[PDB]
Amino acid sequence: PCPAPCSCAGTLVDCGRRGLTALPALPARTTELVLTGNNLTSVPPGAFDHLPQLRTAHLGANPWRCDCSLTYLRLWLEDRPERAPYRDLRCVAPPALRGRLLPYLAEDELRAC
Numbered sequence: 001p002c003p004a005p006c007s008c009a010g011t012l013v014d015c016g017r018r019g020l021t022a023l024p025a026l027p028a029r030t031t032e033l034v035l036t037g038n039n040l041t042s043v044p045p046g047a048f049d050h051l052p053q054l055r056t057a058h059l060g061a062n063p064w065r066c067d068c069s070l071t072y073l074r075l076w077l078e079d080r081p082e083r084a085p086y087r088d089l090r091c092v093a094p095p096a097l098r099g100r101l102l103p104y105l106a107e108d109e110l111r112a113c
């Protein structure tokens with residue numbers, strides 16, 4: 001069962017440029033998720049918690065709001081080395097953090113959302 005707007009191949013789910021504002025329902029066996037070029041501003045805490053085999057998430061070219069709602073996503077991206085190449089998300093919001101990369105924001109800048 002592959003999510004309606006997306007395309008699937010094996011355990012990979014490609015939702016690249018489908019104009020998504022939220023996550024679709026994902027198969028529990030998903031190992032890779034292509035979310036490049038959508039309209040996501042954040043993902044809810046624990047969004048990938050039911051995807052135990054998720055190894056890779058492509059998240060670039062989304063309008064990320066870099067506030068306290070992005071705490072979970074940052075923690076996911078920062079946990080282990082193999083996620084490093086996909087980790088450099090660019091903030092577009094708030095205007096104070098526009099153009100900044102997520103990994104190098106001091107807690108100071110993210111806490112006070």
Ligand SMILES: *[C@@H]1O[C@H](CO)[C@@H](O)[C@H](O)[C@H]1NC(C)=O
Pocket residue numbers: 018019020038039
């Ligand atoms: C993505 O957001 C933009 C506004 O910046 C607009 O084109 C539309 O709401 C969304 N795109 C698609 C393809 O749905």
